[PDB]
Every structure is written in structure tokens, then in C-alpha cells.
């Protein structure tokens, strides 16, 4: 006894692993470069050649929208049919889920070492949660507990309208509106978003922005070498907090609000010093509704693999 | 036991009725004036004697947060203990729920004649639902279908940041921010929200407002007798559309987006003629995500009583 395949595929890397069906324990994690292989199926075939456990069931998390049978990646060239791959492999069950789904399903098996708290009291148990993360884009998922079942609630919530909170942010909205049409939260809360803030900040003060990259905004802000970059990073943290407070109000998320890494781990200290938590509770007479809600950065390394395990196991009739 | 008792209690009136347990049909509705009675219990006994009926179960919708055994009614001499009342009546089940929650629970009982559609295709059955409603305040709730049960997910999503999408709207944002601090969606989408919009529009045009009431705003927008009021109402309709579309993205709400009637039915023709649906779909590349998602205005006469019935019938083990 007795293993299923799990997988966390994102950008150009494909990390695969084994999930113990009885326990949900993940082992034998291996990461392949998606640039070396023509498909996900041809990484799984290598992975499964080199472990010699009979696997029948698999759940792979992939950082792209999962709708029908056809899966097309966002930042890599892979695209495949779920049913074909399932048939081509030995497989009885083949679940393909979005990465934020896998992450939200990891959450109830995370322990306190897997979490860094930012304000709030303790979670109320069995109560709804929100996960978001600013990375390549802005992902959001929710999780609710209904009669022993953990039910994930996927969505495209990083694409809701950007909600400015001052004259400055408002000038940034309109600057972005004039280039790009509708301005979503993701336009400002992601890697490419941190660059949008930078450019908009410089354009509002009537200078010309350099062609900077997200790493350069971070690094020049963490250095204090550029006051445009420190303001970009600084507003990002505020915007991020406000947005997380809206998730919390919206779904009554007293189980807690979680941040999946993305770009934040790379500026933890600045993030901890930032106005994030004040922004989270900056809700007028509803400051009290969210005042005690915990926010956690998740710092577990493979919540994706964990979550796929949980999802699969729950699919196969297990109780998590 | 053929009937259960349902109710819908606000600040001045208590409405009571019988819910047929086999079918969920509501009947023999009657409204009582709160000033005429010392307690909800006393209004209940009256109703049951006048109708010469016996029940062992009840569900009452109340216009307050339900967070404990104690129901902190305004009509403060009416505040009561749920356990106390259940025991005083001889009930086997007494459910007490928030009124806006009850409206959300009506939705699976609603017939096409109770609904006015505003764009989109047919609902995907069993997929999530968002509901929101601009009355005295802005209510928001969601529903998810799990294990043949509709589960309601309450929150305070009316109190999230107002998301302006133009310079005119950002100006209204800042005018409001200068008067109170945090400007929520409710501050703009509700009856008082209309007065706020009108005041801010007048100020933005360097003029002085009158002390107008919510009903003056709608009245004069309808009659085309005030450009400020007309503009106030036009912006409400678009902002209402943008807001629903954000709910739809955020929880993947392919079951439908529903608007509870508070103020809208009073300007139904104005609303139909407005930019509502275009603003719901105005989400840049995620237009195609929400294009097929139907919006409906609920026009049932007593969706609180119907939703109270539905909640109770699921609590008793029925599938709606």
C-alpha cells in the first residue's frame, strides 16, 4: 500500500509526487523542466518509469484556467486533452485542478510552522476561508466546510475592478485606464502589477519611467535607492491588505485569510513593516467585523502537492 | 403535521404565514404591527389562534445579525432568547435567521414569473449563486449547492470599498471620503447611497445640495425633473452592474446573480433603460467569463417567508 500521483505544474516547471492514499502524506517529490519535454504526459511517463509503484489515480494542479477537457497553459506552451492523457496513462481517476484550488485544499492540513501570522486573533473553526496571492497574476479561491466536506470555491476574483482609496490611487487608476481599458486588481496586485504602479507613479509626477522589471522594483525599494520604487512597493502592500479585507467581509471568512507566496516572500521584512494590516482593517464601521480575523502567509513549500492529494482523496471517498 | 410557521420580522411589522411542509408552498400570510404587541411570541400566539392551526416547527426571518441565542432586536423590548421562545411555544424546531439570508434561501423556490432577467444565458444548475440588494443598506450573500442542499454563506460584502471606474466617480469617491472616512459600496448603493451620490454630484459642479430624501432622488430621476437626481440614479444603475459582475467573478457564480428588491422595483423602467447590464460585463478580457451569467431581479411579494420555509424544510431533511 498504496500511492496516487500528484503534481504541481506552473510556469515552466513540473513538480510531480506520490500521495499515500490512506494518509495524504506526500513523498518522492521531483521537479522537471517543462522546457525539456513535449508534454505533461511525457514527464509523468518518466516519473512513473522511475518509481515502480503501480498508480491508478492522479490529481495534478496547474496554474491555468481549467474548464473543459482541453487544458491550455498560460505561461508555458503545453496543451492537452484530459480524457486522452487519462486514457494514455493507466488511469482510473485523473483530476486536473487550478493551482489555487490545490492551495485552498491544502489549508486545513497546514500546521503553525507552515504559517506566518499578520494581525488578528485566532480562527473560528469550521468557518469559511479566503486564499489569495499576488504572483504572475492575482489568484483567489475560497474554502467552506459543509458536513465533514471541504468544498473549494474557485473563481476569477483577481479580475474584479481595482478599488482606489485616495486621490493618488485614483490618478493611478485613470493613468492605467487610459492605456489599458478596464483596470482590475490584478493590474496592480501581481508581478506585472508592481511595474504598473511604478510607471503610473512616475507618469503622475511628470517624469519618464525606466523599463524596470519586478525584481528591480523590489530591490531598489528594499534598498531605498529609488523613492518611486519604494512607493510602488509601499502602495502594493496597502492595496493588498485592503483587497484581502474585502475578501473577508464578502464571504465572512472567520476561518482566516491566507496568502499563497507569489512575490511577497522576497520582501517579507518590508511587507511586515508596511501598512498591510492597517489597510486590511481600514473598513470604517466594519473594522470590528474583520479586526480579529487572522491573515497568514503560507510558508509550507508544496501546498500545491498537498492540496491535490486532499482533493483526490476526498474525490475517492476519504474524509480529510 | 401539515404546516410549519414562517415569519419575516422587521422594525415595525411582523409578517407570519404557514409553510406547507410537503411542498414548501406559503399561505395565509398576515402582517401585524409591532407597536400593537409586547413581544414576537405574543404575535405568534395571536396568529395561531386566529388561524386555528397547530404547528411544531418554525422559522422566522429577522432584520438583524443572528449570532447567538440572544436576538438583539431593535424594538428593543422585543429582544428574546431563541431557546426561551422555542420552549415557551411547544416547538420541536425553531430556526431564526437573518432576513437577507432568508431572501437568499428563497431563490431555489423562485419561478420564472418571480424573476425579471437582465442578460446572460440559462443558469448552470447547482453552481454558486450571488445575491445582493440595495435597500436601506446593501446586503450581499452567496449560495452553494452541496449534497443536494443549498447552503447559504452570509457576510458583510456590502461594506467592501466602493470601486469607482471614472474620473467623475473618483471625484465622488474623494468628496465622500472627505466627509466620512471609508467609502463602502453601501455608501453609494442603497437609498441613503442615492442621497450621497446626489450631494457629491451637486458639490462636484460647485453648487449646494438640498436635504433630499432617497424617494426624492428616484422620483425626480423618473420624472426627468432634476439633472442631479437623474445623474445620481444613472450612476447607481451602472455601479450596481459593476458590483454584481465583481461578485460573479469572485465566486464563479454560474448559478446566477440575483438582486433582492429594495429600492429598484420603484424605478424598474428607469433601471431597464439604464447601463446596468453593459456595466456588469465591463471587465476587460473577463467580459467573456460573465457574458453568459444571468442576472435576475427578484420580484416575489414575500421571498423572506418563502426562504424561511426553504431553510426550515432543509433543516427537517427535505430536498428543495
Amino acid at each position: 500500500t498504496k500511492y496516487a500521483l500528484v503534481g504541481d505544474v506552473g510556469g515552466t516547471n513540473a513538480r510531480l509526487a506520490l500521495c499515500d492514499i490512506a494518509s495524504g502524506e506526500i513523498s518522492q517529490a521531483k521537479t522537471y523542466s517543462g522546457l525539456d519535454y513535449p508534454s505533461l504526459e511525457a514527464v509523468i511517463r518518466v516519473y512513473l518509469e522511475e518509481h515502480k509503484v503501480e498508480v491508478k489515480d492522479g490529481c495534478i494542479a496547474i496554474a491555468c484556467p481549467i474548464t473543459g477537457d482541453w487544458v491550455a497553459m498560460t505561461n508555458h506552451t503545453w496543451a492537452f486533452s484530459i480524457a486522452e492523457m487519462k486514457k494514455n496513462l493507466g488511469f482510473s481517476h485523473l483530476e486536473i485542478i487550478n493551482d489555487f484550488t490545490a492551495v485552498s485544499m491544502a489549508i486545513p492540513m497546514l500546521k503553525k510552522e507552515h504559517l506566518i501570522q499578520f494581525g488578528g486573533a485566532e480562527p473560528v473553526e469550521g468557518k469559511p476561508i479566503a486564499v489569495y496571492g499576488a504572483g504572475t497574476g492575482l489568484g483567489v479561491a475560497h474554502l467552506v466546510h459543509v458536513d465533514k466536506r471541504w468544498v473549494s470555491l474557485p473563481g476569477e476574483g483577481g479580475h474584479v475592478d481595482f478599488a482606489p482609496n485616495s486621490e493618488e490611487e485614483a490618478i493611478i487608476l485613470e493613468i492605467l485606464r487610459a492605456e489599458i481599458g478596464h483596470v482590475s486588481a490584478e493590474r496592480v496586485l501581481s508581478g506585472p502589477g508592481l511595474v504598473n504602479l511604478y510607471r503610473a507613479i512616475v507618469k503622475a509626477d511628470n517624469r519618464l519611467p525606466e523599463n524596470l522589471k519586478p525584481k528591480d522594483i523590489t530591490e531598489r525599494a528594499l534598498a531605498d535607492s529609488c523613492t518611486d520604487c519604494r512607493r510602488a512597493l509601499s502602495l502594493f502592500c496597502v492595496i493588498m491588505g485592503r483587497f484581502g479585507g474585502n475578501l473577508a467581509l464578502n464571504l465572512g471568512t472567520f476561518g482566516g485569510v491566507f496568502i499563497a507566496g507569489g512575490i511577497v516572500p522576497r520582501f517579507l521584512e518590508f511587507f511586515k513593516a508596511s501598512g498591510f494590516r492597517a489597510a486590511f482593517e481600514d473598513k470604517g464601521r466594519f473594522k470590528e467585523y474583520v479586526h480579529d480575523i487572522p491573515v497568514y502567509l503560507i510558508v509550507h513549500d508544496n501546498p500545491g502537492l498537498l492540496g491535490s492529494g486532499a482533493h483526490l482523496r476526498q474525490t475517492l471517498g476519504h474524509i480529510l
Side-chain angles (χ1 to χ4, degrees), chain A:
Chain A
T1 39
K2 184 71 186 104
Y3 301 105
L5 213 215
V6 290
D8 192 16
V9 173
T12 266
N13 299 336
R15 176 122 85 224
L16 302 164
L18 299 175
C19 173
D20 183 315
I21 289 151
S23 70
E25 249 151 49
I26 307 305
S27 65
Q28 307 297 348
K30 297 176 186 222
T31 307
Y32 300 78
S33 168
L35 301 179
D36 294 347
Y37 297 94
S39 67
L40 206 226
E41 188 179 323
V43 177
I44 291 164
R45 286 201 179 278
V46 172
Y47 184 75
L48 291 185
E49 250 308 286
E50 265 119 301
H51 287 97
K52 331 256 211 155
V53 270
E54 297 301 50
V55 9
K56 280 185 86 144
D57 305 302
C59 176
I60 280 97
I62 307 197
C64 67
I66 298 317
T67 302
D69 178 79
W70 191 261
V71 176
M73 294 189 63
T74 281
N75 275 9
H76 190 215
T77 62
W78 291 349
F80 64 96
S81 167
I82 299 176
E84 232 140 37
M85 201 181 278
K86 161 182 160 128
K87 208 113 281 211
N88 296 136
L89 311 167
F91 279 34
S92 268
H93 301 89
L94 206 246
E95 295 290 303
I96 305 293
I97 62 179
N98 181 254
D99 66 315
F100 271 81
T101 304
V103 165
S104 71
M105 290 291 274
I107 277 167
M109 41 217 316
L110 297 184
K111 299 130 146 123
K112 59 194 107 72
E113 326 86 80
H114 305 316
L115 300 170
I116 293 146
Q117 170 153 6
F118 298 86
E122 284 290 310
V124 190
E125 177 58 44
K127 227 94 244 222
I129 126 245
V131 208
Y132 66 133
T136 325
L138 178 56
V140 0
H142 292 81
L143 188 68
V144 294
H145 182 251
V146 178
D147 50 32
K148 286 181 198 269
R149 234 201 102 175
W150 291 101
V151 183
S152 31
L153 296 179
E156 295 287 353
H159 309 279
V160 300
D161 313 324
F162 168 46
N165 212 40
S166 62
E167 266 177 329
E168 196 198 350
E169 303 214 354
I171 288 141
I172 289 158
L173 165 66
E174 169 70 13
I175 280 153
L176 289 167
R177 187 214 59 77
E179 289 155 47
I180 247 41
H182 172 267
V183 180
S184 65
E186 180 179 278
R187 233 84 219 206
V188 125
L189 275 181
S190 58
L194 227 204
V195 174
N196 284 328
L197 285 178
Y198 163 78
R199 289 175 328 113
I201 288 158
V202 177
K203 236 172 282 149
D205 202 43
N206 315 279
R207 287 161 287 126
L208 230 349
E210 246 293 76
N211 191 8
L212 304 186
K213 273 182 73 200
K215 309 235 131 57
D216 316 313
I217 280 121
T218 295
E219 70 135 3
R220 294 175 189 199
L222 258 163
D224 227 325
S225 76
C226 177
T227 59
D228 298 337
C229 281
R230 167 259 133 218
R231 183 101 116 278
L233 227 244
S234 253
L235 267 218
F236 170 93
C237 298
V238 181
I239 295 161
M240 192 84 175
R242 242 186 279 134
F243 179 93
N246 299 152
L247 300 174
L249 290 159
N250 188 243
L251 218 63
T253 63
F254 308 117
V257 175
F258 306 67
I259 300 183
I263 65 196
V264 159
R266 283 123 67 161
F267 55 92
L268 243 137
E269 223 218 309
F270 191 110
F271 180 85
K272 208 175 309 225
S274 83
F276 173 91
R277 183 63 205 211
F280 182 86
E281 314 173 9
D282 185 12
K283 312 297 190 193
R285 17 176 321 248
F286 285 79
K287 182 206 230 101
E288 74 174 348
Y289 193 91
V290 303
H291 178 257
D292 290 315
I293 294 169
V295 171
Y296 310 93
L297 173 57
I298 120 128
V299 303
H300 189 297
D301 305 313
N302 286 290
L305 298 173
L306 229 216
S308 296
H311 181 264
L312 188 49
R313 273 162 22 87
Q314 192 172 252
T315 290
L316 294 176
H318 293 250
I319 294 104
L320 311 189

